[PDB]
Amino acid sequence: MTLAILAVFSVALTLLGFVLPPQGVKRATLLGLALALASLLLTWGKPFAFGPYAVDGVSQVFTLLALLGALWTVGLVRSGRFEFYLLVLYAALGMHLLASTRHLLLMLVALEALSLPLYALATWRRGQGLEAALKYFLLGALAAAFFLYGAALFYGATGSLVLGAPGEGPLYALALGLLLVGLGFKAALAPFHFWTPDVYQGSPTPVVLFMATSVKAAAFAALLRVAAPPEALALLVALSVVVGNLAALAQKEAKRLLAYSSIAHAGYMALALYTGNAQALGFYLLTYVLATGLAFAVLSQISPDRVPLEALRGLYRKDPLLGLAFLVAMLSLLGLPPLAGFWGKYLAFAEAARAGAWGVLVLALVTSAVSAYYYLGLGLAVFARPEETPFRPGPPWARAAVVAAGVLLLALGLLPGLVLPALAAGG
């Protein structure tokens, strides 16, 4: 009954914001999201299903992550339009629904629910932001069509629109493919990745924080629900990691570089999909979400519109703690010890090798080493001599947020035997 909280706050604030100063609405939306997360903790080990709607360990972990991302992204945004909060609220529920069901059609409706309000969140209205928004909507609705014909073909090979239905030969194979298309696009796996560079660079940074954390989370959550075969998995991984890192090399811009990098990262997480461990994947995404949320909070404190790579430089001198935190984020996203990113990566790699897929694992790993070029090209870039750069040094809100996130990262780098004990049933 986190869903209850979500629907309630969204619907209520809709009309309330007519009577409230936009700030009052910000206070409100913030409050709501945090409360939903609270209900998530109080339900740990209490898994609950109602309709096609189902809350279990997975739903719990992945919406814990998603809710976290939504709170952080609302923290930064001070625009005096109450809707620029409202849309976030909507989107959040949408992602929760996406992670919370096996029903293909409810999954579809949930997809529209989460995806439509982000299209509107893509507008600072800076000339790029309309281009970004456009590409996003067109490619998005296309994928909508695909996941829908996929649900229709799943209902095709078998009596149900609910996943887990017994399944045929080639038609079933086809149907699982058509579900895999949309669900894959939403996660930025190659070669579905083309939007990712454009939209991250085009959309206002804090929004991108929201996307690059919450969306990827929810998407992998729904992905685990699908039955996907080893060969396809191999393909997606290979392409994601290769093109992701290689093209990320070519990147002169922080956001875009981060996009390609995130393509590679979706590539890494997709290995957990081999066994679908989800204690492992849950962990990986915990670490990743923390680090990335951090990274984009910092990219927000630089500029909302665009951040080049040099802008990151000299950040240590300016603010020591933010320099350090960004560094840590770069390392956790690199998957280097002793950071939680290493245990997430390791857990995915472990499930991968456990599944006995070797060449794939290897390639993923090799080009994962490729990623260190740009990961240090940022993390170390922190220490160079500061060039002329925009800097607005945050509220306590942001400083304490970013640092907290980093600390949570490295804490679980050393003691995953804290949370990992229950990313499972919740003991």
Partner 1 sequence: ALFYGDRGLLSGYFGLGGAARSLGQGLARLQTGYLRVYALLFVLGALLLLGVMR
Partner 2 sequence: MVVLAVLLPVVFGALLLLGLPRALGVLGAGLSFLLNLYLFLTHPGGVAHAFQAPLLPGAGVYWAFGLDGLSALFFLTIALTVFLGALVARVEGRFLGLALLMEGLLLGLFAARDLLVFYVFFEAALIPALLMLYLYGGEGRTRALYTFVLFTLVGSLPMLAAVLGARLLSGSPTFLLEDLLAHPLQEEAAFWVFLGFALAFAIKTPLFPLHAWLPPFHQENHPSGLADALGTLYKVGVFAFFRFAIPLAPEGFAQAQGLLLFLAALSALYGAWVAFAAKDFKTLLAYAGLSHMGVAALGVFSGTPEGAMGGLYLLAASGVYTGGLFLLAGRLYERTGTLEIGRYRGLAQSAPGLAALALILFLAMVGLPGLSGFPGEFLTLLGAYKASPWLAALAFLSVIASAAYALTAFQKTFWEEGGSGVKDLAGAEWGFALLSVLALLLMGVFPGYFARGLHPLAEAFAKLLGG
What is the phi/psi pair of residue 253, to 5°? -120, 140
Q: Which residue of 36, 195, 343, 408 would you call a contact of partner 2, by CB under 8 A?
A: 343
Instruction: Identify the CA nearest to 344 among candidates 261, 427, 418, 409.
Output: 409
3 state SS of 89? helix
Q: Residue 349's binding partner, choosing from partner 1, partner 2, none, with beta-carbon cut-off 5 to 8 A by kind?
A: partner 2
First CA to last CA distance, the chain: 20
What is the phi/psi pair of residue 117, to 5°? -70, -15
Stretch that binds partner 1, among 77-85, 166-174, 388-396, 406-414 (CB under 8 A): 166-174
If binding means CB under 8 A, how many residues of this protein chain bind partner 1?
Answer: 36
Least distance (Å) between residue 8 CB and partner 2: 38
C-alpha distances in angstroms, 112 versus 30, 229, 400?
23, 26, 34
Q: With contact defined as beta carbons under 8 Å apart, do 344 and 216 qualify?
A: no
Q: With contact defined as beta carbons under 8 Å apart, do 236 and 184 qualify?
A: yes
Q: Is 318 in the site for partner 2 (CB under 8 A)?
A: no
Q: Residue 336's binding partner, choosing from partner 2, partner 1, none, with beta-carbon cut-off 5 to 8 A by kind?
A: partner 2
Q: Which residue of 8, 31, 250, 400 would you call a contact of partner 1, by CB under 8 A?
A: 250
Could you give the string, one character per residue 241-280, with x where binding to partner 2 holds by CB under 8 A and - elsewhere? Answer: --------------------------------------x-
- Residue 108 CB neighbour total at 10 angstroms: 18
Sign of the C-alpha dihedral, residues 268, 402, 393, 207? Answer: positive
Least distance (Å) between residue 254 CB and partner 1: 15
CA 278 to chain centre: 15
**Which residues are near partner 2 by CB under 8 A?**
279, 336-338, 342-343, 346-347, 349-350, 353-354, 356, 358, 361-362, 365-366, 368-369, 372-373, 376, 380, 383, 416-417, 420-421, 424
**Which residues are near partner 1 by CB under 8 A?**
134-135, 138-139, 142, 146, 170, 173-174, 177, 180-181, 190-192, 194-195, 197-198, 229, 231-232, 235-236, 239, 242-243, 245-251, 260, 370
